[PDB]
Amino acid sequence: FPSAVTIKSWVDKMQEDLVTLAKTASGVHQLVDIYEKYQDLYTVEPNNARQLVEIAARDIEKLLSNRSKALVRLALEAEKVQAAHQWREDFASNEVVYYNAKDDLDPEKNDSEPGSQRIKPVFIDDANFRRQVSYQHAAVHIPTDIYEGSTIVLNELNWTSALDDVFKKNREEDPSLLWQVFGSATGLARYYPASPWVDNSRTPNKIDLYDVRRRPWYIQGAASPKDMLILVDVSGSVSGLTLKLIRTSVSEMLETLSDDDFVNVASFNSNAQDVSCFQHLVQANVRNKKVLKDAVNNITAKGITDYKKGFSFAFEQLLNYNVSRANCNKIIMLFTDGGEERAQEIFAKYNKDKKVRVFTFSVGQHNYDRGPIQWMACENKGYYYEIPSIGAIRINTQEYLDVLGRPMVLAGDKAKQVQWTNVYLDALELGLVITGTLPVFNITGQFENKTNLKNQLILGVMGVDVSLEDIKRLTPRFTLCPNGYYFAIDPNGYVLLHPNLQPKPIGVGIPTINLRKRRPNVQNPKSQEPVTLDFLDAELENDIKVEIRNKMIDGESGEKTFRTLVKSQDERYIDKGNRTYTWTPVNGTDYSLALVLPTYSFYYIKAKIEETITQARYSETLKPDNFEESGYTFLAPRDYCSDLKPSDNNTEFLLNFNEFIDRKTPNNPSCNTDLINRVLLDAGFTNELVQNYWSKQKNIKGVKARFVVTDGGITRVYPKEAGENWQENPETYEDSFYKRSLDNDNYVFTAPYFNKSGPGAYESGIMVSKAVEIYIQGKLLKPAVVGIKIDVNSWIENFTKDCKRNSDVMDCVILDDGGFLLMANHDDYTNQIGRFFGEIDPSLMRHLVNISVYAFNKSYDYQSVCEPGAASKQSCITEQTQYFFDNDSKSFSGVLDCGNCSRIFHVEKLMNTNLIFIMVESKGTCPCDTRLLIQAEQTSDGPDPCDMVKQPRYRKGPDVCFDNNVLEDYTDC
Template identity: 30%
Template structure:
């Protein structure tokens, strides 16, 4: 059969650079649609705030996601828990959702009838029609949300929020990476903690919790160090003496362990610690390319016995005040409050007193609002993209499959004239983008055997890669590995010894290189020695780069068959044929009417014109038609073999099958299906 069609065949050489650029443009276009959706929400939120007049006695019922559909003993809906229609939706992992309305989540420690909350929720009702309109314009959108600086979280589509095993809702949108990154620019932080004898007991516990909470507000674009002081100054990690380190997950976890070991003793002298901090920050400022290159701050955590500090500020920070100083007074003692407050107020910072562990979270978050003020006053609506993450906290109690995703987020500012100069951040708007949706735009069939695509960030971390295995099994449960989202490109492409590929991709360059690689197959039982060509480029408008790998001898050429639809359809309809259901021949997961179709059914309906609005990959469909025609004689061949086969000579043969590069599979049973051994 192949000989019959050979004259019509074309063999096309794959241009890897052209391929990676084409994929990148498609990804840029998809991600740009997400950005446009978020921009519409930001505009709607700022306009709604501009037209809303604060009312301290406002009474307003809203859908509280924890209380919806709950009834009291008299079978009446509880307050804030009215009827809220929820239906399973395949697009949202079969969760029960309401696609016509958003609802409101609040952490347990935020009062749901607080006037600030009521006014914010009332104002943000204006986002509902925008959520729905965005989803209609771009049906590939997933979760859209508004996280308010007052603590409420408006989520679309609306869901029923379930508490954790202790009956508590601990999720606070203001602690999430996407909120913090959008609310502030990159920052260099030195945390100074008082470990003198007066800090013993509860004060030390509160101080440690405060440091850990500050560390949790930092991300990949921030730089940090921690200095402890009593009679002398010491960096809690001696290897990091005199420098700032990237606040990635590994460094943050390392710092947390060291903080936990701190002990209080001796007498506190703050001026040496301040001097050391200002020197580090000045060095980072003066050496371009180091640090976050934006905000700089010192966090001073003490119980208040501070002296001899004024001369340090005069020498290192005044009059420009390039470094903000935030002070956290630990304990109930107020004697030293004026001094500690003076330090913050004279260095463009913020003073707060923390007397219990419950106060820590709320008081630490205040520094973010101060650091966001320059952005607010300048109205810098920076678009941020997060590193890959699995928000298991968001739907821990729901049947959410753990998907790697990135979030696009933007800050929302007050545009009111009377508060504009104060720089008021209203919150952050965001939307999630599952990374698997992005990689659908770089289909495997175009990359040949052993070919693959991968994504990484401008910090060198992997967003998506076939060798990134972020989950492990604990009993029957799948859980994320501790550092799943800070795996460096050099850890998976380890043949890149000189980091040529890594450096080029971090810098957003376009180019290619070749490497000899060892590829394990059959679950590590065998190793292949291959030469891989790496093609890479940036995805414009994002901090991401895309890489495409083609294996020599496998992904260099494409066979283009020229088969008529009539001939191909005839052979596609044979009962022994199937298509790889995980491949995307036609898009069936957006239109609800198409979701019930298998990929083979979708292809047939597309070719017969039954579903003209189906969107299909015509190049892949053409390849499948060609493969169906060329492999059609196998059915007759296998039947002849089966008829001539004697039980003695061919004992043990149960099934014959073949697969093609276009995902087509043909099979023939040699025994009854009940006798298949499933080996």
């Protein structure tokens, strides 16, 4: 086995060759020189991070205030218009004319069911709604199993007809408005602008199950948060049908709860116990509700009933105050069938003063006695419900929110505060939205102290949607490098705005279905949950990020520079970077906005091209015909002008952009002239480099391609026969190799993908890249990244020139930080290039992790897709692994023993790159192995929620709580 100095010499020659080839054939210094030689087509402007966050925070505050103004308009008109309604019952003469959404519009139908008349709209097509929309009237949604034609429904479509004028005025004053909705307590939803529903009940074969009363925005604006305890009777008498209905009922009841409510499910039969692992009230997020639903589905029925024990248990659960709670609406929900005991002693002992409400549910068809539980309800300010069948569940488990809203109605105008929801996915396919809501009150006989009977409930909730792409237009990201960004935060942890938040649902657990119990045509239910992604599950988590999070959950301003691990765009690498987080509160709201800037991104380039000559020349440089002199050119699909839209066929976009820059003058009447000026400047620079330098050597020895990727958004790949092997994103802010080469100060090698369908090992090559970094006036800027593809075969034959091709005495590999194979020695190793080394030699890789030449970090992706196991693709949690270098030492010698064998090895880190060279004794000598070491998204289920609940994340609750008015009635029960 060769000495240390022979291996040192081998790797020094190797890295000399590699680095000199990349340096002289990519043109880093040449581009630096042409960037610094101009210095007068541009100016270097500062990125004041504290001014940026405050500007953006005021723009977001102004948007949400403009929306809170259009809700207060709708609510006042709705109250005044219902106060003056007459309550007809004869509509067969005086019709109600309205547009029922989800009815078919081919004019050969002509239903117009009795008492009402239909509307056929015109339905222009629109942007800002990617569907066909009519600004003339409002559309009405009625749940499928609610007959329209009722006297309740027709009296509703009669007075809600005066909303359309405020809908129209709201939209006329703020043309950037999305959906405006009134959700009624009768099930109706009147929204503007009109648009056909996504699912009709009988049109196709998928029945739509949408009821406004179960929507997060409605439930949020209907009542205050809750401290719910669900007490489930599992005595023997509930066995059979009523137990099956109780399980379905408790799951439906849990689905009306959000992240500001706290829940636990207990159980009693002669002894009361928690149904789960939880033992107190927990925050009722998607993971905790998953735990509780799966624990409820395991319930069996045996024993004698003891209401006293169960109620003692419940009242003690609602008295902890040691754990995190809502402190708002202590309620018990008793799911039973029937009994003889009313437990007056326990109520006299435990809520003497009636601070805890009691809602009782009598489930099933049984002969038992219901007097006692109706009494329990009517005594403790609660309510009594009967659930005889499955079709009765949904409506009876969503109706307790009328009782909870009485003390909010009795509060008057103190209770009309706008609220914003979590991020959820629009039901009319608009993407990710938040909705700001407002409750509407029934005020009849108000100016005369008359009615106060029907007047303790609300009429419904007004809502107004705000899409997250409206909020991403107020935090513009094209003067920060690809590594900086904005992100906003709830007073709950959850993220309103982050790079890593996608439009997909959050996955819980491992997805498993039973394929042998699925009828083909029965219309599965889909989803109702929000996209609640905590801030510490969107990024890698230090100890400093936790205190930053806790600090800006408590509405604090601040700033902090530190050093952290950053995961790469493609989740395979990890860099170590310096970052600056600068945060502030959004003043009208409970959100907080922060800007992450990597130092080296404090200055940007603002173009100063103000003569037509060079502007026009630069505009000529990017035209497909002359590609063979500037190399294949890609353009970043941004919004440079309001007219040309991103196309995703990048040659189409380039043609449109050329047509647009020359057909309309560079005076740019309405375009973003800064983006266009920057793109033109950068095209000029990149073309100067391609002409003066890259063309003088049309081909180099091992150089397979050459590329420049700049800010502005220009990509140029020199031999156009490489231009179609280039599969990177054309948007230079999503290129993983760009962001990685900005973080390092040396050459970054990207490993190809292994076993990928397309040209990926010997067709393309191995990508090397380096960031161009310039000093204008003592300021650092990294405006572009140059690179190269290296030919595999040329590298092999410089690599073999005591390991030669297919030597069987030892192995020589070259890996990168990440553990991916780049240059092998064995011709069956080199067949798998770009594969994780622990998957082609797990023993030595585990030992390298053990020696601490490789560290690793594990994460969870909560928005992943999985092919379900046995117990299309559904949503899942997956665990991700990323390896990297921790120790800064150049050499690691050693000997790994499998026992009965001992392979001696030497690894040496190549200087000035991200490569490691390993020389180990061969593997086929001694048959020792344990198991593969995988670096891939592995479908997971954790973390364990029974432990996160014992030590939970810091949190801030709403401080407004409307319960306990003394003018309440509770004669209705």
